[PDB]
Amino acid sequence: TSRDALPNTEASGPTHSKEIPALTAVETGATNPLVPSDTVQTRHVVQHRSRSESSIESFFARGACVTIMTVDNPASTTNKDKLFAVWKITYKDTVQLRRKLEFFTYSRFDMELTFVVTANFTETNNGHALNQVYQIMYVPPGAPVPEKWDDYTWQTSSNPSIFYTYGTAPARISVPYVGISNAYSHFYDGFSKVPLKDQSAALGDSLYGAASLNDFGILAVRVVNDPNPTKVTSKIRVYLKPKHIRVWCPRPPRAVAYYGPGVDYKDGTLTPLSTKDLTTY
Amino acid sequence: TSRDALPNTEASGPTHSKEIPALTAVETGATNPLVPSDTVQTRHVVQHRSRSESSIESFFARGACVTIMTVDNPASTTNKDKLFAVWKITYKDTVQLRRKLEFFTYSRFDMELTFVVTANFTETNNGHALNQVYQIMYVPPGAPVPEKWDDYTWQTSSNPSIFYTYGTAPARISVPYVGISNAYSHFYDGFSKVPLKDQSAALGDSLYGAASLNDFGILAVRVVNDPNPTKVTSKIRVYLKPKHIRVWCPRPPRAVAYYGPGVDYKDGTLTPLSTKDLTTY
Amino acid sequence: GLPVMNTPGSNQYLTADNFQSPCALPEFDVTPPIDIPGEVKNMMELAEIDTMIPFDLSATKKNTMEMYRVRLSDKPHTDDPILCLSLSPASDPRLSHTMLGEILNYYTHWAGSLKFTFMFCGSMMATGKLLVSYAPPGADPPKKRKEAMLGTHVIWDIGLQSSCTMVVPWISNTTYRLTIDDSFTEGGYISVFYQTRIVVPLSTPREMDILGFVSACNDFSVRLLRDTTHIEQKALA
Amino acid sequence: GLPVMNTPGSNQYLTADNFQSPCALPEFDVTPPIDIPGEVKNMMELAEIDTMIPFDLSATKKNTMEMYRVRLSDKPHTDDPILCLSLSPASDPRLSHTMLGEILNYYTHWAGSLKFTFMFCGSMMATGKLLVSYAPPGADPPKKRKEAMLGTHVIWDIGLQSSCTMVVPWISNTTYRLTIDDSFTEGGYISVFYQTRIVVPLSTPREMDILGFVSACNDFSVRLLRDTTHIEQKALA
Amino acid sequence: GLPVMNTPGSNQYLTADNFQSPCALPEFDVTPPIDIPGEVKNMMELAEIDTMIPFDLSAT
Amino acid sequence: GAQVSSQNYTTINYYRDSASNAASDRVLQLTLGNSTITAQEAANSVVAYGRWPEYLRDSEANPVDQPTEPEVAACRFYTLDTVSWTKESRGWWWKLPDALRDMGLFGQNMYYHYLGRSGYTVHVQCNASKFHQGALGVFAVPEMCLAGDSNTTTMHTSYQNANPGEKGGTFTGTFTPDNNQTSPARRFCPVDYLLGNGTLLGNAFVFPHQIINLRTNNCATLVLPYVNSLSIDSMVKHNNWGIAILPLAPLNFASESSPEIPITLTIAPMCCEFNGLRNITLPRLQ
Amino acid sequence: GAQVSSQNYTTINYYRDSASNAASDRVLQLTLGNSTITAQEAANSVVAYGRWPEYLRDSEANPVDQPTEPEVAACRFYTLDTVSWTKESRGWWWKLPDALRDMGLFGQNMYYHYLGRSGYTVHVQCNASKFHQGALGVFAVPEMCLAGDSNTTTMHTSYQNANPGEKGGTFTGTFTPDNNQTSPARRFCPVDYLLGNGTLLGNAFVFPHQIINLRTNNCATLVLPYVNSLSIDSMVKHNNWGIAILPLAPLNFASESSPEIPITLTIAPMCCEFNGLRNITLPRLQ
Amino acid sequence: SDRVLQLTLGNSTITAQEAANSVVAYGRWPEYLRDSEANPVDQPTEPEVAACRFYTLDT
Amino acid sequence: CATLVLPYVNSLSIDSMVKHNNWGIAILPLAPLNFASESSPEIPITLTIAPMCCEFNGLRNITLPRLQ
């Protein structure tokens, strides 16, 4: 197991032999597996440290913010339309979890989502409001998307929903692995269409690196109460925790600022390293 | 066990012998282990008292305040920056637990932290506010420190955090022993640098008794809500309980007022004893 | 799900409670302990060590080094006391700042026997005999050897062994005594007298000092942890 | 129903907690996994791979390809160093952006031995001998072969095998070292010197390059996961 | 009584949850079922029946 | 029904879904079909991830119809063009299976079917004299995505510019953003020290790789299995591997100011199979 | 899985981390190396905490390289300077291993290595006549930290003033704050009745100690093991022990107004070992 | 085989790829002084790794 | 390169290292150095020496010889 201790150090004395473990060849493509006992005299040490905290499960066992959505309940004495929020599910709106995940090419994991809701008043008027309730609805691809805050789509005969009362514990749910491949693709080197000579130029065009492998629907959030005389503005923060995670094909981590949802970089951000003299400690 | 009763008293009659247990020599460095039966005639007593309440576990089984942090959510109709609190973890901001701990030189213990939050209004204006939520984030050494109340550092992809809703039970967490030595050092008689003759005077300078053994990061606290038209000021009290505690090398307790984080004392505070005549009861 | 009912005491914080809470650093790799000398398992282990008593808290001797020394001389024999001390180990100004007193000031109840040790710091050419007395409470405090001779006492002959020990046994009406000044749980009185005088030859100092120490016996215990008045604060950090 | 009492920590959200929650898609039919090459079980598996070191971070060479190459020549023998490097794998500008440094910047404590590998990229007609040295902290950093010769060191003879490996063993007072610049947990110094000079025949280049790599040994570990300063953001999405 | 701690997701309503709730009509005498022809156990049973295709969706 | 473990402690699962639960070496000879390769100065060979290419098993097959396995007709060594290494070179890249789209019967099978999969053997050849110096790094990257040349749009590279074929592309030392809004070029701008995708070159050794050092060896060999998140896929839409060659140390010869040597590539498909036969595809490649 | 105990009651652990769980004598002879000591008026000897010095065991060793054990070359008695005890004396202090930094090969090994550890034997010698009176208290303090002389800054004592060497320092009867803001002295101001660290002298008997009473004995012996929160450490940055000598009863002789007697100290390292060899350290000690 | 050599003493190592083997003078390896040949009577000092190591002189 | 392993040789079991030298190392050109057609070639020669099985007796104050 990951909590198993690391190997002990062994005592070694002076040596005089033809075999040379120090010299090697890196052109082969391998790494020399030397231990301290091959170059200096060492003593016997009983090892106690372990690598339990660097496992893949431990490296991802935190909740990371993936988005902040905004809703409001407007004043009754205005003409503004009530605002409801729509968000397309993705982990690429933020940088920390994105950088942690893109250490690898493929991954499988179950997900755990937590919702933290906060609210505030917008006008100095002493007007009041009663406790609010929020509806969070998951709309998979191909399902009807709401257009008004109170149209029929919110009946949720088949779409799962959460009803959350303000001031209680933050909401939480769990999701399984729901991909149509055998693993999630962090990178995709291809297109979705192949242009054809007979067809027109515009009929074969598509974006580079975009595929329907990464279409998971949207989350729609509304305030279920009817408007009060005073406006109330609310923000919902979404936190994502991956669990039971497996990864494949490690990659170097990002070194420059992210620019969009691809591997593109922006001019003026391509100097990640600082100055240091060659013979200075 | 600590709840075992103390030894019984034994009956003793008159004595007439050469052996003298009363006379001794304190120059050796030991303490004379006399019992009442060695100097007076005693009766038989069955003992019932025990020393269960003076053990090391019992002596430290209370929650002690270690700091009070201050945050606020300002008015929407002002230009003041929103205030978030930063605190460097230490038990030396207060005196009671510090004095209790400094009875000894070294210690190991797990920790239990409890957070008690209170809030109030700052202006007579009848303006109102909705229930607030607080984020408490632990930033270990070397991690990025927040500079604004809503910058990216609060995404907490890897830093543990607590989200607390006002009006609920006080928050609580537990921590293991997290030192880089084999025990905590209450005192350190040394420096962190050794000055060198070749180098300049300023390049070797360091503070006396300061070492990186006692660097544990900071706690950052913010209000997650957006500002209301009225200002709300909140204070958070932190309470520390050590459990599973072991100690080494007892020391005399502090007799004069503490002055800074060292063993230094201030002029005008060096008279802890009161007056009493030699031959007065 | 399961039907439950909330009882009084829900959502309170008691600083003496004992409950489990979630861990903020799961799977942390804890450093193992080593064998360090000087481990302590009980606070009563520190009270069984003798510590010097500041007997002479005069206006000119207190808060100096002279407060630990009791002066003796070779004057003609007298029946007046050398020192007087009330048995209040936590509230007596001459006993409250010893190690035993410091530990007692964290508790409310104490019980057990005590031992006082005296050391003589004169020349090897000096001789004398002293009387160390303890009197239970209820009567007048002794002021003459005649009265002190009726309570518990030891006669100390100064020779090769330069130290004497006197044990104060547990004689109480209650099972525990309070760690404050109280008439219902008063402890008694302690005094020292000349049995004979101090005798020296010529070419020897005629004045000397004695030192005193106090500690607890193996049947000593305390209870009801509390807070001390020996430390305070005005500003945070 | 059952009488219960709520304890502190109720209705809080700790991002490191581990609790069960209801499933939003019950009875979902999950796709089974296949056998893909390149599965990783530990993050320390990625730190045991050698990665090139950008030694030459000059104002004109940094953020280019020339920063990975260390220049050597056939000049007369000298005792001055070729490169100097402080053992701070997470905070040294020349080590912080290697794979080991990137992984270390997600943690607070590290421990274990390291290995540095050097490769020579001259002609087959060139010969020479070099000295690779590591010095524990406390004294002056070496600036001459005379001083560097007193610490740990290897002598590299350039022949059919064009690579050399030098292991830096774990020599620390604490059980773990911090991943920041710190005087109490400083690591030591590393340097390279000419043992003899570089010798070439006629019709051969007189200047060549060497490359360097760093990786961890099998007794290396980290702890206290944290956040990095190597990525930031200003606007959402 | 028993010390308990409330976790995130308390006092929420998830429309896909599966929990027990109290019965509003206890001791009700339920009518037994009879054997009716045409019982369906899966929705895929209805997809395995052929249905006519409207091929010619002309404007007329 | 409770589970007892050690830390002991007890755990119980409340829900029916598991998601709810809380967590010698110098000498080499290769023979494929009617083609052979010999090498006398090799640094051994690399098998990517320790996995040899293989055929698709019944317990992992998505499509239901009978696959096609050309074998010797397509599993053979094809030689691409030869590039010239000078002192101004920054590196070259190729995509697989894009570089073999016009190679005998392999290309025909690729363009006649809808699904296909295959592994590869890559052999890079470069020889010089004992008075030359230099070093090349050869890297095989799964899902080698490159950055575009536009700072006003992202992911706007055209299908034609991302699939050059057997000629491949080259890295550059500087990033030049394209500013023609009327006629955007829609092509990659890969920078060498960023590996063309925003990551430092020094870390590229996480991928399978080898080094050709002119004083040690003159050839490199990489054996690549099939890697993807699917069992089989479309070879005309998606590239599985990318080959990148970069000068780690610049080329130099005696005292000449303009030395040059050729570099050649030979690639062999392995265990290739196809599904979904129809009329042939005719892409717009210009 | 529940645990039943007595008060009976039942407890269950919910979490995987244990942190979450709710809680003859007068005569003496010593021989080390080529050095010997004899004593005819001793009060026995004290072993601090009942632990004898020992070498570091394999199951507690942090560094991995082979340690150095000089043994007889460094484990031997060194005599420091001799101080004069008069009627105006307040006491003296020394730091270990700071007082042996210029003592034969022990100092050389100390300044050539990076890590070191050792125990000690301390022997204090003071003799007088049968017509003298007085008493000395000798205390060994682990982590003996002293207070500074500044009331505007804290922990500002310089490295030079905190390491006097074999000469040591002295206590004072009064606290004198330093007021030179331009040229701060940066030195300790240890007060005798506060033991120099804000704690009452009468309680100093919690530390290992002995008493020299002029009418009983003339020497004291303390055996100190290695004490620290680490297995091994830097001897040039950190002092492990402090020795403090204070007059418990003032010196007096017949009727003379100015008696004086010498006090001598002899210290022997024990079971000392070193790690991390490099070039020698050259501290700034003035 | 004879061309290749590696030596390790204390914290110092040497490698060689073109050697002509090595010579042991008179066929005798260094050793410590035995009890049956010791003149002085006091306990000797054996620094070992602290002094048995490779030192490089000038060139 | 050349490697020589020297045991301790003397007419005594142990001796004074500051008065008496046990070994001498001599390096001589058996054939003169020559390179192509250059008239002034030059190459460096380096020496590395390691004590083995060293031991000492008779500890006292340190010796301070007159070496200039």
Ligand SMILES: CCO/N=C/c1ccc(OCC[C@@H](C)CCN2CCN(c3ccncc3)C2=O)cc1
């Ligand atoms: C009403 C509350 O019910 N919510 C239910 C629910 C169900 C399914 C949901 O979809 C989860 C999709 C995620 C597991 C996808 C995460 N990943 C996997 C890889 N990936 C990605 C995105 C873009 N480019 C590459 C990869 C992602 O964004 C969300 C919410």
Ligand SMILES: CCO/N=C/c1ccc(OCC[C@@H](C)CCN2CCN(c3ccncc3)C2=O)cc1
């Ligand atoms: C978001 C809530 O998560 N909080 C997590 C957390 C994790 C670790 C934390 O660090 C705990 C460090 C303490 C155990 C250190 C206490 N001690 C040990 C000795 N010591 C000290 C300080 C100064 N001088 C001497 C000793 C201390 O201050 C704090 C909070």
Ligand SMILES: N[C@@H](CCC(=O)N[C@@H](CS)C(=O)NCC(=O)O)C(=O)O
């Ligand atoms: N727009 C309607 C109110 C909306 C309404 O009643 N919607 C019905 C039928 S369209 C519904 O299904 N609402 C869904 C819900 O809000 O729960 C009005 O004029 O009041």
Ligand SMILES: N[C@@H](CCC(=O)N[C@@H](CS)C(=O)NCC(=O)O)C(=O)O
């Ligand atoms: N300053 C931004 C708001 C702050 C914001 O959106 N921050 C994002 C990206 S910097 C974030 O990561 N916030 C962290 C959080 O507050 O949870 C604004 O002008 O509204």
